[PDB]
Design a binder for this molecule. Sequence first.
Ligand SMILES: O=c1ccn([C@H]2C[C@H](O)[C@@H](COP(=O)(O)NP(=O)(O)OP(=O)(O)O)O2)c(=O)[nH]1
Ligand SMILES: [Mg+2]
Length: 254
Amino acid sequence: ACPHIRYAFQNDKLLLQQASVGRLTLVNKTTILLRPMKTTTVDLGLYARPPEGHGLMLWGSTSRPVTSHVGIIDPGYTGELRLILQNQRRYNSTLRPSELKIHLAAFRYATPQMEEDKGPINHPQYPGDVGLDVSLPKDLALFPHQTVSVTLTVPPPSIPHHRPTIFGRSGLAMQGILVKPCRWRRGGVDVSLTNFSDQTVFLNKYRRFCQLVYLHKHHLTSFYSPHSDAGVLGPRSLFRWASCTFEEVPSLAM
Ligand SMILES: O=c1ccn([C@H]2C[C@H](O)[C@@H](COP(=O)(O)NP(=O)(O)OP(=O)(O)O)O2)c(=O)[nH]1
Ligand SMILES: [Mg+2]
Protein backbone atom coordinates (compact mmCIF):
# COMPACT_ATOMS: atom_id res chain seq x y z
CA ALA A 1 0.00 0.00 0.00
CA CYS A 2 2.17 3.04 0.95
CA PRO A 3 4.32 4.02 -2.07
CA HIS A 4 6.96 6.66 -1.28
CA ILE A 5 7.03 9.77 0.80
CA ARG A 6 9.14 12.27 -1.20
CA TYR A 7 11.01 14.68 1.02
CA ALA A 8 13.86 17.20 1.00
CA PHE A 9 15.91 18.09 4.17
CA GLN A 10 18.52 20.83 4.86
CA ASN A 11 19.20 22.17 8.31
CA ASP A 12 22.53 22.10 10.00
CA LYS A 13 20.90 22.55 13.48
CA LEU A 14 19.16 19.17 13.17
CA LEU A 15 20.15 15.63 12.30
CA LEU A 16 18.37 12.86 10.40
CA GLN A 17 18.09 10.04 12.87
CA GLN A 18 16.39 7.50 10.60
CA ALA A 19 13.97 7.06 7.76
CA SER A 20 12.96 3.49 8.83
CA VAL A 21 9.85 1.58 9.93
CA GLY A 22 7.88 4.07 7.68
CA ARG A 23 8.62 7.18 9.75
CA LEU A 24 11.22 9.90 9.40
CA THR A 25 12.76 11.08 12.69
CA LEU A 26 15.00 14.16 13.07
CA VAL A 27 16.73 14.93 16.41
CA ASN A 28 18.14 18.34 17.61
CA LYS A 29 21.87 18.83 17.23
CA THR A 30 22.09 21.94 19.40
CA THR A 31 20.36 23.10 22.57
CA ILE A 32 17.08 24.85 22.00
CA LEU A 33 16.03 27.49 24.49
CA LEU A 34 12.38 27.49 25.64
CA ARG A 35 11.15 30.68 27.20
CA PRO A 36 8.44 30.24 29.86
CA MET A 37 4.80 30.45 28.70
CA LYS A 38 5.95 31.47 25.25
CA THR A 39 5.63 29.66 21.88
CA THR A 40 8.86 28.08 20.64
CA THR A 41 8.87 27.28 16.99
CA VAL A 42 11.43 25.03 15.27
CA ASP A 43 11.79 25.52 11.47
CA LEU A 44 12.81 22.12 10.19
CA GLY A 45 14.25 22.79 6.74
CA LEU A 46 11.98 19.81 5.96
CA TYR A 47 9.65 19.49 2.87
CA ALA A 48 7.48 16.54 2.01
CA ARG A 49 4.77 15.28 -0.36
CA PRO A 50 2.50 12.52 0.91
CA PRO A 51 1.75 9.74 -1.51
CA GLU A 52 -1.70 9.60 -2.98
CA GLY A 53 -4.60 8.83 -0.58
CA HIS A 54 -2.46 9.73 2.47
CA GLY A 55 -1.80 12.70 4.74
CA LEU A 56 1.29 13.64 6.71
CA MET A 57 1.44 14.02 10.49
CA LEU A 58 4.15 16.01 12.24
CA TRP A 59 5.09 15.74 15.90
CA GLY A 60 7.74 16.08 18.52
CA SER A 61 8.43 13.70 21.31
CA THR A 62 10.52 14.46 24.27
CA SER A 63 11.25 13.36 27.75
CA ARG A 64 11.27 16.88 29.08
CA PRO A 65 8.59 19.17 30.41
CA VAL A 66 7.56 20.50 26.95
CA THR A 67 4.35 19.71 24.99
CA SER A 68 4.37 19.75 21.19
CA HIS A 69 1.55 20.41 18.80
CA VAL A 70 0.63 17.50 16.56
CA GLY A 71 0.33 18.87 13.03
CA ILE A 72 -1.87 17.59 10.26
CA ILE A 73 -0.21 18.73 7.05
CA ASP A 74 -2.47 19.55 4.14
CA PRO A 75 -1.71 17.07 1.37
CA GLY A 76 -1.12 20.06 -0.88
CA TYR A 77 1.29 22.00 1.27
CA THR A 78 4.73 22.52 -0.34
CA GLY A 79 6.35 24.82 2.19
CA GLU A 80 8.88 24.30 5.03
CA LEU A 81 7.46 22.25 7.94
CA ARG A 82 7.61 23.69 11.51
CA LEU A 83 7.31 21.97 14.89
CA ILE A 84 5.41 24.08 17.47
CA LEU A 85 6.36 23.55 21.10
CA GLN A 86 4.79 24.82 24.27
CA ASN A 87 6.39 25.24 27.52
CA GLN A 88 5.05 23.73 30.62
CA ARG A 89 7.53 25.35 33.16
CA ARG A 90 7.54 29.02 34.26
CA TYR A 91 11.35 29.48 33.86
CA ASN A 92 13.87 29.09 31.13
CA SER A 93 14.32 25.39 30.16
CA THR A 94 16.31 23.76 27.39
CA LEU A 95 16.12 20.85 25.16
CA ARG A 96 19.64 19.39 25.00
CA PRO A 97 20.88 17.52 21.88
CA SER A 98 18.55 14.57 21.18
CA GLU A 99 16.17 15.51 23.90
CA LEU A 100 13.83 16.43 21.03
CA LYS A 101 12.82 13.92 18.41
CA ILE A 102 10.77 15.27 15.48
CA HIS A 103 8.60 12.76 13.57
CA LEU A 104 7.03 12.88 10.15
CA ALA A 105 4.76 9.97 9.01
CA ALA A 106 1.82 9.28 6.76
CA PHE A 107 -1.66 7.81 7.23
CA ARG A 108 -4.55 6.81 4.91
CA TYR A 109 -7.67 8.94 5.47
CA ALA A 110 -11.08 9.49 3.89
CA THR A 111 -13.22 12.61 3.47
CA PRO A 112 -16.95 12.42 4.03
CA GLN A 113 -19.23 13.81 1.27
CA MET A 114 -21.17 16.70 2.67
CA GLU A 115 -22.75 19.66 0.89
CA GLU A 116 -23.46 21.43 4.18
CA ASP A 117 -22.00 21.82 7.63
CA LYS A 118 -23.39 19.26 10.04
CA GLY A 119 -23.70 21.35 13.25
CA PRO A 120 -20.17 22.40 14.35
CA ILE A 121 -18.65 20.23 11.69
CA ASN A 122 -17.65 22.39 8.73
CA HIS A 123 -18.10 20.51 5.39
CA PRO A 124 -14.95 19.98 3.37
CA GLN A 125 -13.70 22.63 0.97
CA TYR A 126 -12.98 20.04 -1.85
CA PRO A 127 -13.20 16.19 -2.10
CA GLY A 128 -9.72 15.52 -0.65
CA ASP A 129 -9.50 17.79 2.44
CA VAL A 130 -7.49 16.13 5.26
CA GLY A 131 -9.45 17.55 8.13
CA LEU A 132 -12.80 19.13 8.52
CA ASP A 133 -12.73 22.11 10.80
CA VAL A 134 -14.99 22.12 13.83
CA SER A 135 -16.52 25.25 15.33
CA LEU A 136 -16.78 26.21 18.96
CA PRO A 137 -20.42 25.87 19.95
CA LYS A 138 -19.96 28.60 22.61
CA ASP A 139 -17.76 31.56 23.49
CA LEU A 140 -14.87 30.42 25.71
CA ALA A 141 -12.22 31.92 27.99
CA LEU A 142 -9.07 30.14 29.12
CA PHE A 143 -7.19 31.61 32.05
CA PRO A 144 -3.44 31.29 31.92
CA HIS A 145 -2.57 27.63 32.80
CA GLN A 146 -6.07 26.38 32.56
CA THR A 147 -7.56 23.33 30.79
CA VAL A 148 -11.11 23.50 29.53
CA SER A 149 -12.99 20.76 27.66
CA VAL A 150 -15.60 21.42 25.07
CA THR A 151 -18.25 18.81 24.57
CA LEU A 152 -19.41 17.83 21.08
CA THR A 153 -22.43 15.61 20.83
CA VAL A 154 -23.07 15.90 17.14
CA PRO A 155 -22.66 12.53 15.49
CA PRO A 156 -19.79 12.82 12.94
CA PRO A 157 -20.58 11.57 9.40
CA SER A 158 -19.68 7.86 9.15
CA ILE A 159 -17.17 6.16 6.97
CA PRO A 160 -16.57 2.41 7.03
CA HIS A 161 -13.06 1.35 8.06
CA HIS A 162 -12.30 4.90 9.25
CA ARG A 163 -11.97 6.34 12.80
CA PRO A 164 -12.87 10.01 13.37
CA THR A 165 -10.08 11.67 15.30
CA ILE A 166 -9.72 15.27 16.67
CA PHE A 167 -6.43 17.24 16.25
CA GLY A 168 -5.61 20.91 16.93
CA ARG A 169 -5.04 23.71 14.38
CA SER A 170 -1.60 25.19 14.17
CA GLY A 171 -2.82 28.80 14.19
CA LEU A 172 -4.11 28.28 17.70
CA ALA A 173 -1.13 26.31 18.74
CA MET A 174 0.92 29.41 17.59
CA GLN A 175 -1.18 31.29 20.14
CA GLY A 176 -0.32 29.07 23.06
CA ILE A 177 -3.56 27.09 22.81
CA LEU A 178 -3.18 23.32 22.29
CA VAL A 179 -5.72 20.55 21.70
CA LYS A 180 -5.02 17.02 23.12
CA PRO A 181 -5.62 14.86 20.03
CA CYS A 182 -8.12 12.13 20.61
CA ARG A 183 -10.71 9.66 19.31
CA TRP A 184 -14.12 11.00 18.61
CA ARG A 185 -16.13 7.85 19.52
CA ARG A 186 -19.78 7.05 18.96
CA GLY A 187 -21.48 8.93 21.73
CA GLY A 188 -19.52 12.24 21.47
CA VAL A 189 -16.14 13.56 22.65
CA ASP A 190 -14.77 16.09 25.07
CA VAL A 191 -12.02 18.11 23.44
CA SER A 192 -9.23 19.34 25.83
CA LEU A 193 -7.74 22.76 25.42
CA THR A 194 -4.85 24.17 27.38
CA ASN A 195 -3.77 27.78 27.53
CA PHE A 196 -0.04 27.59 27.69
CA SER A 197 0.34 31.39 27.45
CA ASP A 198 0.62 33.99 30.21
CA GLN A 199 -2.69 35.71 29.20
CA THR A 200 -6.37 34.88 29.26
CA VAL A 201 -7.36 33.79 25.69
CA PHE A 202 -10.88 34.45 24.52
CA LEU A 203 -12.19 32.26 21.83
CA ASN A 204 -15.28 33.19 19.99
CA LYS A 205 -18.36 31.09 19.42
CA TYR A 206 -18.15 29.44 15.96
CA ARG A 207 -14.46 29.81 15.80
CA ARG A 208 -12.72 26.81 14.24
CA PHE A 209 -10.83 25.31 17.15
CA CYS A 210 -9.76 21.90 16.01
CA GLN A 211 -10.23 19.57 13.09
CA LEU A 212 -11.70 16.18 12.41
CA VAL A 213 -9.59 13.62 10.54
CA TYR A 214 -10.84 10.21 9.47
CA LEU A 215 -7.83 7.96 10.09
CA HIS A 216 -8.06 4.52 8.50
CA LYS A 217 -8.48 2.01 11.33
CA HIS A 218 -5.16 0.25 10.63
CA HIS A 219 -3.59 3.40 12.22
CA LEU A 220 -5.00 2.59 15.69
CA THR A 221 -3.39 -0.16 17.74
CA SER A 222 -3.30 -1.27 21.35
CA PHE A 223 0.42 -2.31 21.04
CA TYR A 224 3.44 -0.25 21.98
CA SER A 225 6.09 -1.15 19.46
CA PRO A 226 8.70 0.44 17.20
CA HIS A 227 5.79 1.04 14.67
CA SER A 228 3.61 2.99 17.14
CA ASP A 229 3.77 5.99 19.47
CA ALA A 230 1.62 6.54 22.56
CA GLY A 231 2.42 10.26 22.60
CA VAL A 232 0.00 11.29 19.83
CA LEU A 233 -3.40 10.16 21.02
CA GLY A 234 -5.21 9.64 24.35
CA PRO A 235 -4.45 6.49 26.53
CA ARG A 236 -6.32 3.59 24.87
CA SER A 237 -5.20 3.73 21.23
CA LEU A 238 -1.75 4.46 19.98
CA PHE A 239 -1.12 5.88 16.53
CA ARG A 240 0.50 3.40 14.15
CA TRP A 241 1.62 5.16 10.93
CA ALA A 242 1.65 3.74 7.41
CA SER A 243 4.85 1.85 6.21
CA CYS A 244 6.38 4.15 3.66
CA THR A 245 9.78 4.67 2.47
CA PHE A 246 11.25 8.04 2.13
CA GLU A 247 12.74 9.05 -1.14
CA GLU A 248 15.01 12.00 -1.00
CA VAL A 249 14.01 14.68 -3.54
CA PRO A 250 16.43 17.56 -3.00
CA SER A 251 14.59 19.85 -5.50
CA LEU A 252 11.46 20.15 -3.28
CA ALA A 253 13.42 22.50 -0.91
CA MET A 254 12.46 26.13 -1.59
O1 LIG B 1 2.76 21.49 13.19
C1 LIG B 1 2.48 21.96 12.05
C2 LIG B 1 1.18 22.04 11.56
C3 LIG B 1 0.90 22.59 10.29
N1 LIG B 1 1.88 23.07 9.46
C4 LIG B 1 1.59 23.63 8.09
C5 LIG B 1 1.16 22.55 7.08
C6 LIG B 1 -0.37 22.61 7.07
O2 LIG B 1 -0.97 22.28 5.81
C7 LIG B 1 -0.64 24.06 7.34
C8 LIG B 1 -1.95 24.21 8.09
O3 LIG B 1 -1.88 23.68 9.42
P1 LIG B 1 -3.20 23.75 10.40
O4 LIG B 1 -4.33 23.58 9.43
O5 LIG B 1 -3.12 22.87 11.65
N2 LIG B 1 -3.25 25.40 10.97
P2 LIG B 1 -4.66 26.38 10.67
O6 LIG B 1 -5.78 25.42 10.31
O7 LIG B 1 -4.89 27.28 11.89
O8 LIG B 1 -4.21 27.23 9.33
P3 LIG B 1 -4.47 27.02 7.70
O9 LIG B 1 -5.28 28.27 7.37
O10 LIG B 1 -3.07 27.03 7.03
O11 LIG B 1 -5.26 25.73 7.55
O12 LIG B 1 0.50 24.56 8.08
C9 LIG B 1 3.22 22.98 9.98
O13 LIG B 1 4.22 23.35 9.30
N3 LIG B 1 3.46 22.44 11.23
MG1 LIG C 1 -6.29 24.12 8.77
